[PDB]
Design a protein around this ligand. Structure first.
Ligand SMILES: N[C@@H](C[C@H]1CO1)C(=O)O
Ligand SMILES: N[C@@H](C[C@H]1CO1)C(=O)O
Ligand SMILES: [K+]
Ligand SMILES: [K+]
Ligand SMILES: [K+]
Ligand SMILES: [K+]
Ligand SMILES: [Mg+2]
Ligand SMILES: [Mg+2]
Ligand SMILES: [Mg+2]
Ligand SMILES: [Mg+2]
Ligand SMILES: [Mg+2]
Ligand SMILES: [Mg+2]
Lengths: 368, 368, 368, 368
């Protein structure tokens, strides 16, 4: 039942992603000394100018200058011409910091969860490739293989699909668009060649690459001193690339900068968890689990499982499976998913869903 | 086939929405003197501090101080204690301004369109009510009826649904959560009473209000000097409340601050247009139109119509209907939808879709 | 030998003075926990926006938000309309903080010292009155006597003089100009009356007030929401009001924000010390002591005493008196003057010289 | 009657001086299109971040981005590593601009004027050399002779004096301290050599250089990426280096950023004028003219001439000479000195007094 789809992703150098990372870096820095630290912060950046805003109630001694500059260094901004230098950039900290199982969900909410068997990660091929494409570039950057590669990058992958008496099977990569920051001493011809052979063909399964697959490598020509500027960088502005690449559903809640007590993060993770668990347990090939919460109430206020006719069990057979295998109460989620651990920074880029190294990405057994 | 859903919206005073409005106000200010002005700007705010960033190639004389302060005044920030005063706030302008039909779509893209017959607006009841709830509060604020009401507000509406051999039929409003900024001289008891009788019951159809409907009015107590701080307001961070309240699909593209040449805005509008037209023409009760574009190419690179079995025509009968009634090329879209007109500021709040006063909300005839 | 002179001073609310105080407040906050803390910071403010910049090598835990907001509170900025509210203003901290007798003067320098017997403080009448005028207003503000009085103020005092076979004897106050911020509910007539009877006549000695003395109270009319704005506030920009009101000599070195190791502060204090000691010891009626330092060298590189023919001893009789009573080496200065003590904030306003509560203002014995 | 003195100066790259220049550049930009433009602005900078603040009532179209960036370019900040790049730095403009002979002096004031015959410029040798030292470095920088030389620099000159039955006669340069920013590829040994032979010895008269003269060239080692940060540059914070190097007297009024209607600038210029005229006319070898003004009154409120016994005429013979040759009323000053002309930027560095290219530096005839 043919149709096509496109998804995108950005590198660690993208202005918005730098803020997402810095905000989560501050979250990590607090969890390490106080796993109960209440973090609610965000970052704004603009050409060698980083603004740390936020309200965080914790009891840990943190050097915000150090945590912000270290994060910028990690990303790869050490030289001047790159558009950012952790040693010289302005780090304005306007942060306010205080000191002092059946909890109850804060704020009426509705979290979504999604999973599909088109890839081993249980995530849309389009977004997975988009992320992996950026990931590979960072590797070649940090390894030395492609020393002209700079932190800021953008990726778009559009794959042609076809349904299957249930749902979504990828056929081939229609076109790929990738833009990456770079050093001056490197020709546009050499860049485009390296992007096709060393990054694209090294991550995209042969099955999907074609003789007609369209490539748009460095379309707008040069991207040298670009760096993290883009008029301004902000936290929580890359909501779709942090999730499913526009495939599931999204209520609009941002992750980065918020601790484990905010249902926007935790419950979203939990919802992905059960979704991934369901397909992994063969109970379906594609699911859209919807978990609703009521302010004050701990136990979820109605969970809905949405298979696209890919399950043999039947919605409200699968719901009982979820109700017998999962306890989606906020407090239980953080305990089961180990959400007090400082893993949030690595979650701040290349997507929150898909990577197996995260608790919520480890499928639960599911006793049926 | 019961399930519940929740959606949210924010008032004109919400930090993020102030930026969305200011950014669009600058867009309007340029279109009025140069309908071909290239606008790409964004705003950041934080307690009496507004930062205007951006790159805009236009040929019009604009007083940015005037357009920013006027927008803040319009929102209702004239006094000190409200958390913003257009006469005293810092307006830092770091704006860079230059001077000098079958076009061709910029940037690989994938826009979504959605519509459902559950309301006359052809939008999800949950998001419509959420928006209208905030709209009414602004009316009572500007009329004088509720003079304690202040600009910043947040709304959440969760409605219980049930499918119907096709899709989505609202049954009742399960719970409503509304928080609004206010003046000191007004009791929490009087506020909650006014919110239920004068705002909620004056906008929510009797059919949906129940004896069990849950109300959470000013849940966190007092919201007085809670003016635009919310730890830094930003542009394009309220992506879901600007669209379908998490019902359709969203690629992640922001509207506010971008002119009509960016497919992220125009094409998204066009997609809504055809979606609304389809259901209005009785061709379906619920649609998810998906329009894809290829960088460089003008004509859309594959459009997909997604009915949920609510159409009698059959996808790839409806596609021809769309291909015979619509010309979704970027240039044609702006011409047909009159996208060079300065209506963008009023689009910057209370949702981009739903309100009939916008070109894209006027259903096209559809000759079949 | 008639001539006239004018001097000025500003209140604790003056933008520049707020920065001078905040900068010194941060200095105090460090000295209390590490008397060897190396402080080099400055502040910038602009309508509810305070920027703390600086490089400080210390080993003490300080809450910059607390030290900045507390200083703003102390000044009297607690309400909105006053142009500053310590509870709501933006405190952007871009501060960088590290951790780890015959010293030797840093930076080639030339410090000046001045003293005259026209007042018991051994300071020019013009500047003393100018300071006292502002001081009294703060008292009436903090006591409650004049509750309409606000933090920002400016004072100018011009006195008619006459020489005396030596130097400078004040005759009468020619004119007084005073401007002070205020609340709305207070008439311009009532303000001007209170300024003349309760502030001016309560501080200016009867001997100097005349029937011709000119008064300019609130000349520019109203000064309500003025507050600390004045387009921006800065540290070290009120160099003359911090010293002698334009009577001695000034090399241009700023005090506030610099610790006791900077000769610009310490040596300047030391120079005032000896000047005050000389006149107090009857060795002269007016002196301008000039102390020069050489980078690297500890012992002062030539000290010059400048009496205006008011001494009977004779320059280079008085120099030996100074060389036999004083050891102006940097390290000795800080030890003798107890410069590691946190008294710098109270030094940040109403003048550094004159007030007896400071070590350098306590005359040394002088054995001759 | 031996004594020593020291004075300092800073290059066009010094943070404070960059602000002084930018502020005056904006003043020039307005005068060129509206000689009656009311300018009152100031600048703040900090590592690739320039903030333009101010209130200016004028009727001229100015591109503040252009005037700020052009000024930074002129100074020599075009590359990244230099600590500033006019093409990449953040120029935040928070400027507010409106549109619409016997005047009367604004604000009670007291301006000082000074001149001495120790140099042809009629300025203290110490400050003249200090300025010229920096000037030469800029020449070698802009010529190409010393291509490693960067914009930021600081200079200190201490000369040994001796009185003369009147006053001040320089004997020799005791020590010279000079620090200048530089490129990486240049040894500390080569820099110090070039500073002594090509800059110092090329500007300092042989008569003053000695075999004992102490040189401190690049004392603190390397000053590479020491670009404009110096923990925030500001306008009007270099008050003494803009005048007499601590030789005359200074009330504390800043020049840069203020138009010709502010007595702080105009009258100060006028006072220098008469001082220079007096010594040039042989009426004295050293003068300290003191001009006082009364708010509202046009004609100066008492002018005092202070010779140090270097005149044969006698104070109150010289006063009549001044009263018969000069009309120091504000309006007349601007007319006679051509103060509506855009020469203020070149006045913003290397000193306001001394250079003959300025109107006030051209001695008036003086008919006696
Ligand atoms: N910086 C932009 C592209 C550069 C080349 O203009 C980006 O995010 O891809
Ligand atoms: N704020 C100015 C005066 C006010 C009345 O215009 C001052 O520093 O005196
Ligand atoms: K945007
Ligand atoms: K968002
Ligand atoms: K100034
Ligand atoms: K100064
Ligand atoms: Mg993107
Ligand atoms: Mg492109
Ligand atoms: Mg970019
Ligand atoms: Mg002053
Ligand atoms: Mg006045
Ligand atoms: Mg003021």
């Amino acid at each position: 039942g043919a149709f096509m789809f496109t998804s995108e992703s950005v590198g660690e150098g993208h202005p918005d992603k730098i803020c997402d990372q810095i905000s989560d870096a501050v979250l990590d820095a607090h969890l390490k000394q106080d796993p109960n630290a209440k973090v609610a912060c965000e970052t704004v950046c603009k050409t060698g100018m980083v603004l740390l805003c936020g309200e965080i109630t914790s009891m840990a001694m943190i050097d915000y200058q150090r945590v912000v500059r270290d994060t910028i260094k990690h990303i790869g901004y050490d030289d001047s011409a790159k558009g950012f230098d952790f040693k010289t950039c302005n780090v304005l900290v306007a942060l306010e910091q205080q000191s002092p199982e059946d909890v109850g969900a804060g704020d009426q909410g509705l979290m979504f969860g999604y999973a599909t068997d088109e890839t081993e990660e249980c995530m849309p091929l389009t977004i997975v490739l988009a992320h992996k494409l950026n990931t590979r570039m960072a590797d070649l950057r940090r390894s030395g293989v492609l020393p002209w590669l700079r932190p800021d990058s953008k990726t778009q992958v559009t794959v042609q699909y076809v349904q299957d008496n249930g749902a979504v099977i990828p056929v081939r990569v229609h076109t790929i668009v990738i833009s990456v920051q770079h050093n001056e001493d490197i020709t546009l011809e050499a860049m485009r060649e390296a992007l096709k052979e060393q990054v694209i063909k090294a991550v995209v399964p042969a099955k999907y690459l074609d003789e007609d697959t369209i490539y748009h490598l460095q379309p707008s020509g040069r991207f040298v001193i670009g760096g993290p500027q883009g008029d301004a960088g902000v936290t929580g502005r890359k909501i779709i690339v942090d999730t499913y690449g526009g495939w599931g559903a999204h209520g609009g809640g941002a992750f980065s900068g918020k601790d484990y007590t905010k249902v926007d993060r935790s419950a979203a993770y939990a919802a992905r968890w059960v979704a991934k668990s369901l397909v992994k347990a063969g109970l379906c090939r594609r699911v859209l689990v919807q978990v609703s919460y009521a302010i004050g109430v701990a136990e979820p206020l109605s969970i809905s499982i949405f298979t696209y006719g890919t399950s043999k069990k039947t919605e409200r057979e699968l719901l009982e499976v979820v109700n017998k295998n999962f306890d989606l109460r906020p407090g239980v989620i953080v305990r089961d998913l180990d959400l007090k651990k400082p893993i949030y920074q690595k979650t701040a880029c290349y997507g929150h869903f898909g990577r197996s190294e995260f608790p919520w990405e480890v499928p639960k057994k599911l006793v049926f």
